[PDB]
Structure 1
Amino acid sequence: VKGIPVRVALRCRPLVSKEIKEGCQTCLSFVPGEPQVVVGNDKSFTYDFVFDPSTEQEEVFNTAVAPLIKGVFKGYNATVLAYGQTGSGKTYSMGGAYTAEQEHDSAIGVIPRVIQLLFKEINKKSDFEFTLKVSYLEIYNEEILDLLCSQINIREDPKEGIKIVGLTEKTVLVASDTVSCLEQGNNSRTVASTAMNSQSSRSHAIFTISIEQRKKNDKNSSFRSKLHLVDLAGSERQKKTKAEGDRLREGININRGLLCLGNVISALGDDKKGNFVPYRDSKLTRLLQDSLGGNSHTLMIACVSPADSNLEETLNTLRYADRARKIKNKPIINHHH
């Protein structure tokens, strides 16, 4: 493999209550010390990391995420995005529903952990001054909604890419007020019950931290980068969700967006001169243009259920996760002068 691929961590959660009630057996097995998973006891996939159901939040973060976050201090953009079927563990893994109740709980996921690490590293970079800002949006039924509110349009600037016109941002100072923004946005994120997840995310959420870094003795030059922390909505099937009405139309919109994402992953996984990548098909894929194929170090956390009743869905995630690893990104150092 040449260049800088998208990196992929496969995270299998434990069986959940619904699966135990339905009498499901585990259909995934793991090869200890190797980043491989075997599915339907027949097909094997390899990723950059494989985390079995016993893997704690802290291990997922320290092994797969932390090294990436430390790269922002070199001036890189970075993205972590969670991808998989409804109920698979995206929100859990990302801390997409974190509230202050979870502070100091070992169950906290990626976004609160990132915030802790950023301020730990800032504290050790005494020679530098930092400015952090955050925005937090959801894509809900084809609309971009600002989660830091108690219309927004994409414009593509001809130089330097996508601009989300109307989206607000908060400048943050310390860890506490940074994580408060997560909490604030999570109180607004559209969540509702289906049979597959009592706390299903009905939107794709993107928490973005903008970081500017300047050396104190050389203050004309800085680095300016962005960290995108993405808790996608997940594929769902009406026969399993039992959704009707507004809930069903949410699932339709979600599924349609995730098809557009699959199209982008598939085009990029087989990229070459003159190829076309259909970023423009959805608002989601427009916002992920640098994250997938562009100026970003990117990790996908592909989330799966171990239950045999979800074999088809799990196979789909594994296949797209395998394609994602063939995506080549081009992260540069984001100098500003």
Structure 2
Amino acid sequence: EVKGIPVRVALRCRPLVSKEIKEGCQTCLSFVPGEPQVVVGNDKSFTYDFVFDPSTEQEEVFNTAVAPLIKGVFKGYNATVLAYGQTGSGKTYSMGGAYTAEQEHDSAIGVIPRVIQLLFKEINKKSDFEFTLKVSYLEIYNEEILDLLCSTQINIREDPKEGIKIVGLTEKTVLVASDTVSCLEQGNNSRTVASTAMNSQSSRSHAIFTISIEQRKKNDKNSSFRSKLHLVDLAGSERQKKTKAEGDRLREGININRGLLCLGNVISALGDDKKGNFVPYRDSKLTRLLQDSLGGNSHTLMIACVSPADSNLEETLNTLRYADRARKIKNKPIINHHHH
């Protein structure tokens, strides 16, 4: 029995990568055809809302798991898609967190460029309605919020009558798909990325791409829906013994791991939520920004990314365990009406 509106979880297993083939890894994950199950270490089974094996292409991930969620923003809901998993697991790949214009029309494009396409397709169908879209794009780098659309210090202020405000963050008002994707491209070029042994293009920050959507009926300008879509490419857990990181790179890894610890503590707290519980959102900027997304006013999809390689079994088990806990989180999305 599942009561209410849980966080949904898609488990995505990428294929083996060159590093793993080089080191002689075997696959340690197996799948059960047509069932949303994965078997790990040929022994332990986990069930999710979706399971995508290594052959699953970007288009299928999007159409199966993401598109139905995005369509909910047109009913006036907030929604979040967040990718979570070890370094090198495929979060940025899945999300399109490194998309550039060079990738336009490549079937390898990920979630964010696909969301932008879909939003404008749906807007064009909804000829009886008018829309306002704005985008912001930030990263959380070594515990600071940096504006990725900014080629002063940004701070979180809690409004008493509902919600976080990110003071000093810029927004662009967009008109069509092309200028919306330009924002993604621009922010992606600013995202802090560096090499480690586990990923030559490791994300050194958590990135959040936000589209604010206002919808109103053309025959009635006073009433609207106003909601937000957050598209989140987290940084991933890493171990110095595998990354070989030193200096500033290792400091990034420490800050990343600490934040992900805070996220794990939030997920664990929410799994058994009840009256009088405490959930440690306040412990990190990341978990403050994800407060509505996890346990609050949002429809939320986690894309949990894993490597199939036996050398990563421990990390993969950690991701599977936390992704299993995330399914127990109950959200309370409402229709975000506004009247003027």
Shorter-chain TM-score: which interval?
Answer: over 0.9
Cα deviation code 1:9-64 (max 9, x no counterpart): 00000000000000000000000000000000110000000000000000000000
Provide the rounded CA distance (Å) in 2 between the counterparts of 1:159 and 1:318.
36
Deviations 1:215-245 (A, max 9, x none): 0111100000000000000000000000000
Residue 336 (structure 1) aligned to one of 318, 323, 339: 339
Render the CA deviation track for 1:275-295: whole Å, top value 9, x for unaligned.
000000000000000000000
- Say if 1:39 and 1:154 are closer, same or farther in 2 by CA, change over 3 A: same
Q: Quick one: structure 1 residues 282 and 336, their matched pair in 2 at CA, closer, same or farther if it must change by over 3 Å? A: farther
Give me the whole-angstrom Cα distance separating, in 2, the residues matched to 1:218 and 1:168.
29
Which range is displaced more, 193-202 or 327-336? 327-336
Instruction: Note if 1:312 corresponds to 2:309.
Output: no
Contact 1:214 1:223 in 2 (8 A): yes
> Unaligned regions of 5+ residues in structure 2, if any?
none
Identical-residue share of aligned pairs (%): 100
Q: Quick check: 1:209–1:228 contact (8 Å CA) kept in 2?
A: yes
Tell me, yes or no, if the aligned pair for 1:83 and 1:231 is still in contact at 8 Å.
yes
Q: Tell me, in whole angstroms, the C-alpha distance in 1 between the residues paired with 2:164 and 2:282.
A: 11
SS in 2 for 1:71: helix
In 2, Cα distance between equivalents of 1:173 and 1:330: 31
How far apart are the structure 2 equivalents of 1:290 and 1:126? 31
- In 2: Cα distance, 1:22 partner to 1:213 partner: 52
Give, in whole Å, the separation in 2 of the partners of 1:316 and 1:100.
35
Partners of 1:189 and 1:109 in 2: how far apart?
Answer: 17
Measured in 1, the distance between the counterparts of 2:101 and 2:137 equals 17
Length-normalised TM-score, structure 2: 0.99
SS of residue in 2 equivalent to 1:122: helix
CA shift digits 1:292-329 (9 cap, x unpaired): 00000000000000000000000000000000000000
Separation (CA, whole Å) in 2 of partners of 1:190 and 1:141:
11
C-alpha distance in 1, partners of 2:109/2:71? 19
**Unaligned regions of 5+ residues in structure 1, if any?**
none
1:140-161: CA deviation from partner (whole Å, max 9, x where unpaired): 0000000001100000000121
CA distance in structure 2 between the aligned counterparts of 1:97 and 1:149, rounded to whole angstroms: 17
Structure 1 contact 297–329 (Cα < 8 Å) conserved = yes
CA offsets, 1:180-201, max 9 Å, x none?
0000000000000000000000
Count residues in correspondence: 337
Indicate yes or no: 2:61 matched with 1:60. Answer: yes
1:208 maps to 2:213: no
Q: CA deviation at 1:72?
A: 0.1
Matched residue, 1:99: 100
Q: CA RMSD in A?
A: 0.4
Give 2:275's match in structure 1, choosing from 273, 276, 299. 273
Supply the distance in 1 between the matched residues of 2:138 and 2:219 (Cα, whole angstroms).
Answer: 36
**Residues 224 and 336 in structure 1, CA contact (< 8 A), matched pair in contact too:** no
Deviation for aligned residue 1:336: 3.9
8 Å CA contact 1:9–1:48 kept in 2: the answer is yes
User: Per the alignment, do residues 336 and 201 of structure 1 end up closer, same or farther by CA in structure 2, a change over 3 Å counting?
Assistant: farther
Q: Quick check: 1:82–1:94 contact (8 Å CA) kept in 2?
A: yes
CA distance in structure 1 between the aligned counterparts of 2:189 and 2:66, rounded to whole angstroms: 25
SS at match of 2:173: strand
